[PDB]
Symmetry: D2
Subunit: 263 residues, 4 copies
């Protein structure tokens, strides 16, 4: 099939990529980095996230695979020593796909800027452009809280082991179609009040962040962070789109969690 391989660009990852290309040449496998059906990332989770975003417009037509040439990644979850076996099994195809949910972020502006949408595999976060971050949090059109603090983080299920975890969020199995909102350093006193707890939302729930005074915000989607100006609204919802993984063996999520954080 059409495939491509992205590399972290260090010596180890580049050599593994060239060797896998040579192995794929021994099968009916065409290299095409325009319309691949298979996208292999070699490096770490950052490499894998860049691969996802390089091809985010063809997600339903691609099966992703990640190889970690450093320590075990949550997406880059296969070892370099298994690369030949990976080549053999992808070339023959007939493998099963596993799908993880994604986060849709919509940013609406004042007039002159059209709204923009972004897809996240880990999370989207919002922080101020300097000074206090203050937004009204509106859930399905219901005013829930006025948040004053450092920022907010909205995570996918597979993102829950990343920034979300450092913020106190729950780890959620990625078969759950949900998104999770965590606080960054909310103030709570006689004047200001937030829920504190992480909040877990199902599909079709919409969380809208609306500015109170300052309208400039630093918005991140996975590794990318951009200062957005004259923002009127930031809307989060579970995406209808899904990322598809090729799996060639059982490596359960909870075992990946164990392997990464416990032992």
């Amino acid at each position: 099939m059409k495939y491509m391989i992205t590399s972290k660009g260090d010596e180890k990852s580049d050599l593994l990529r060239l060797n896998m290309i040579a192995g794929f040449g021994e099968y009916d496998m065409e290299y095409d980095d325009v319309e691949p059906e298979i996208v292999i990332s070699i490096g770490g989770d950052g490499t894998f996230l860049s691969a996802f975003h390089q091809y985010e417009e063809r997600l339903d037509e691609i099966a992703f695979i990640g190889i970690h040439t450093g320590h075990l990644g949550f997406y880059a979850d296969w070892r370099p020593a298994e690369a030949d076996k990976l080549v053999k099994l992808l070339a023959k195809g007939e493998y099963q796909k596993v799908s993880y949910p994604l986060l849709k972020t919509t940013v609406k502006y004042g007039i002159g800027k059209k709204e923009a949408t972004y897809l996240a595999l880990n999370e989207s976060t919002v922080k101020s452009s300097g000074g206090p971050f203050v937004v009204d949090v509106v859930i399905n059109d219901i005013h829930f809280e006025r948040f004053r603090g450092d920022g907010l983080c909205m995570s996918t299920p597979s993102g829950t082991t990343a920034y979300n975890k450092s913020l106190g969020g729950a780890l959620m199995h990625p078969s759950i179609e949900a998104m999770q909102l965590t606080e960054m350093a909310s103030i709570n006193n006689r004047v200001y009040r937030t829920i504190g707890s992480p909040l877990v939302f199902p599909k079709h729930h919409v969380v809208s962040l609306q500015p109170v005074n300052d309208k400039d915000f630093q918005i991140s989607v996975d590794h990318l962070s951009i200062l957005h100006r004259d923002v009127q609204e930031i809307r989060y919802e579970v995406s209808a789109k899904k990322i598809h993984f090729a799996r060639f063996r059982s490596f359960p999520f909870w075992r990946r969690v164990h392997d990464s954080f416990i032992e």
Copy 2:
């Protein structure tokens, strides 16, 4: 239809119950506390939990309703002033039902005691019988961690605003079919290691707690707490059974959260 009304037993709740019975007498509504189709609880969330457990063997045939005669409850979410309207609308029926997921707890013993199962609407917790609480946590047959601490709490979605919240757990919308495990005071040092974060599990995942040395544990299910002896295993999974509520208007979960914790 057949209905019954349970009361907290204070003056306010008993009088409201007698008045609602009188109002139901004005319709085709038979009082039956053996096979009710409608179970109305008057008091607080504790009253409602006792109603649920009184009828937990006929859950698929009952629609529950809670009236709070004190402050707003998460299950006792209707005001005494709306009791006449409640009577009018239940008697005519034709109302919609809302279903929340439940937690199944299985306790297995050494020989001589048969296993026991319990259903929880809020949560099930496990604590030691004195001294350190130590269990191996096994998720779908995979050894995940050895927990040493004060205890563990496994919450339903609607339970997440209760004990779970006080333990740092996420609040989850109750349409998500899941259960959530939180720690109570785990030790973490060079010898001992736990995940720390709350863990959110989907349907069909099984979490098994297995004793390491001491085999006696204090096990709670909602308000009930019993010392269990010669325990071999405690198994948690999302139940196939569901509790059904009568709803006569929109009172969204996230608005109940807001009303209870924010303002």
Copy 3:
């Protein structure tokens, strides 16, 4: 004595200031905003912090007083209705002083920039200039941890009810001569490890933050935040200097905590 009054600059605060000046004119009290012995701040805690920093070079010669024209402040802890009584009692003098500890922050640079020192009444924080914040944390010359995360916060005792509290830090009575370090969103996994817990340091302990790769950091001291370039070291220690308050009645710290966060 020489005194001055700083105002938040809203209508309420400016009018109170002019009225207090008129009342001071009825005594032997000279207005001097160059060498005051008394510095009265009218507004909120931000106003009070700006007063402190305006006069931070004459701290041993000044008694500070804060009036809150909004809600109760932890430094602006007297009501506008008591302004006449305040005037009467300051003019006659003979009042007792209360002293709170301060935080000394030293920033050392590469060659071409001389080191700079800053005094904090609430806290000093450090965050990256974009991207991950990574520093080695060295305590009395002993390498304690490599921190990777969003940032770090070092609080005075009276600062512990401010940013420190939002970060999970302990509240400490301000008679304790100490400083407290809290984390902002540290990553912890197989590669990265931090203590997690807030750390409380006595006088003469020195905490040194040393860069690992990136050398640009956003450093804050109380309300002020500056991007510092080519930083070699950030050193924290309890200052030898103290801020002095005039007190005219008992308003215990723990009662201020209660009044601000409990009821």
Copy 4:
């Protein structure tokens, strides 16, 4: 001098104890477990805590030393391989002493039971006798909060790395004369409100816990836990007494923290 040695009672610890006694016999060192001047504990931190409580009535006349025959302890902080060097240096004396602060707990009863005082090296905790734990928290005679939850923990400085740490408390250098209060699972909602944050108190501050309805409590002091009945008040304050350690080299607290929790 007079000395004694307490052992964990496993094979390793008993043999080390007999060998150290033999080595002490080669000097002017008399074994006396009634009035020792030196108390050596061999085992773990639990062994050391039992040694402390065995001799808590002669604390000003004793220098304690702990050897860990398992992993490094915070009190049992010397290795078995250094036992001969320990013998040599204790026998010659002339070593420096290091002192850590202690916690005084007073339990007052209804009539018929006289008040009781207890000294803690790690912490004192209070939990209910079954059901909710509810106390009024009074700080220097000022009503601070009504706590409803699982319990409360009051830690010494050297205790802050123990239970206190698992409860979210700050780690405090043990030269600070203070005690630290942490919550266990407080409920917070529209009816109930606590500070949440750990609270750090200096010497001479008194924290009084007063029952609201139930008067039976499980009170722990270090490893010991007793059910106390008809309790009227539990009072915490930093003790005037101090525990004294023999030190024969620099092993800084923050390095012990690093060695135990980081690497």
